[PDB]
């Protein structure tokens, strides 16, 4: 079954701002998603020091960037801690509410959209370039889920029946028609070098 949920008002508001605000420096979405991946990898790595069996679902800690011109998608894959159903439905949104509030206030103060990560809500920057975001995720303590939202105030969660992931997260960006530059090898290389050069995990840029 597919379950549909309403974003809390503040999150819907932030998503609308991200979609509606004129802001040319869209490339920062990638550093935010890679940051999310890095944090998730740090988390499982740290947890594994006390419980080595947490890596039974996979020892390699890495990030893959996968462009697909046929589907017009850019996929950011990591073998981080992943997310439970409760993370997807409740926990992330609960934490994000205060980050969203603070971010929107800072914006009203003169901050700009590129500072979104300082508020812990960098994930939503995905909507700078994507009409729809699909998040496939697998945490050790739960099943594989697909979260999805085209904004408009609602998201869906379902159990995922695609290729099993072992552990980690895939963020699938269904790019906007005018944002296909982010499928180009040289463009992604440029952005990673500029914003994500010191990430402590191998980042592999797949080619088409
Ligand atoms: C320590 O790592 C646990 C959380 N990890 C992630 C979280 C997200 N992410 C998601 C959020 C979110 C909201 C605020 C902040 C981050 C958010 C959603 O609300 C939809 C699902 C994915 C997106 C991607 C990741 C990731 N790559 O692990």
The atom of ligand 1 lying closest to the CA of 147 is: 21
- Chain centroid to Cα 57, Å, comes to 21
At residue 65's C-alpha, the angle toward residues 189 and 44, to 5°, is 120
CA dist., res. 14 & res. 7, Å (int): 10
Q: What total number of domains does the chain contain?
A: 1
CA dist., res. 91 & res. 83, Å (int): 10
Is residue 33 within 8 Å of 76, Cβ to Cβ? yes
12 lines ligand 1 (CB under 6 A): no
CA dist., res. 88 & res. 155, Å (int): 10
CA dist., res. 147 & res. 89, Å (int): 9
**Inter-residue long-range contacts of 43-49, CB under 8 Å, 24+ positions, other chains counted:** 43/80, 43/81, 44/79, 44/80, 44/81, 44/82, 44/167, 47/81
What are the start-end ranges of the E strands in the chain? 3-6, 63-68, 73-78, 130-138, 144-149, 154-159, 168-175, 203-205
At residue 22's C-alpha, the angle toward residues 16 and 26, to 5°, is 90
CA dist., res. 146 & res. 160, Å (int): 5
Q: Which residue has the tokens 């509030």?
A: 101
Give distance in angstroms: CA of 123 to centre of ligand 1. 6
CA dist., res. 155 & res. 110, Å (int): 30
Residues 6+ apart with CB under 8 A from 143: 85, 159
Q: What b-and-e string marks burial along 159-190, b requiring 16 or more CB atoms within 10 Å of the CB?
A: ebeeeebebbbbbbbbbbeebeebbeeeebee
Q: CATH no. for residue 159?
A: 3.30.565.10
CA dist., res. 39 & res. 199, Å (int): 10
Binding residues: 36, 78, 97, 123
Give distance in angstroms: CA of 122 to centre of ligand 1. 9
User: Would you state the structure tokens that stand for residue 64, as one six-digit string?
Assistant: 């893959």
- Chain centroid to Cα 62, Å, comes to 15
Q: How many residues belong to the chain? A: 208
CA dist., res. 199 & res. 192, Å (int): 9
CA dist., res. 7 & res. 11, Å (int): 6
Secondary structure (3-state) at 10: helix
CA dist., res. 184 & res. 51, Å (int): 40
Question: Which of these, 25, 41, 31, 76, lies nearest to 195 by C-alpha position?
Answer: 31
Give distance in angstroms: CA of 92 to centre of ligand 1. 7
CA dist., res. 204 & res. 180, Å (int): 19
Q: Which domain holds residue 198?
A: 1-208
Residues 6+ apart with CB under 8 A from 204: 62, 63, 64, 65
């Amino acid at each position: 079954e597919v379950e549909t949920f309403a974003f809390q008002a503040e999150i819907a508001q932030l998503m609308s701002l991200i979609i509606n605000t004129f802001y040319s420096n869209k490339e920062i979405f990638l550093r935010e998603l890679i940051s999310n991946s890095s944090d998730a990898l740090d988390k499982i790595r740290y947890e594994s020091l006390t419980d080595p069996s947490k890596l039974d679902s996979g020892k390699e800690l890495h990030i893959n960037l996968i462009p697909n011109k046929q589907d017009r998608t850019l996929t950011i894959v990591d073998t981080g801690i992943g997310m439970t159903k409760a993370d997807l439905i409740n926990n992330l949104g609960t934490i994000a509410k205060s980050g969203t509030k603070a971010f929107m206030e800072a914006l009203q103060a003169g901050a700009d959209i590129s500072m979104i990560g300082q508020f812990g809500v960098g994930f939503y920057s995905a909507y700078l370039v994507a009409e729809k975001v699909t998040v496939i995720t697998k945490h050790n303590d739960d099943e594989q889920y697909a979260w999805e939202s085209s904004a408009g105030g609602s998201f869906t969660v379902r159990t995922d029946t695609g290729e099993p992931m072992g552990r980690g997260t895939k963020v699938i960006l269904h790019l906007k028609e005018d944002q296909t530059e982010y499928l180009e090898e040289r463009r992604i290389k440029e952005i990673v070098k500029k914003h994500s050069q010191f990430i402590g995990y191998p980042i592999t840029l797949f080619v088409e």
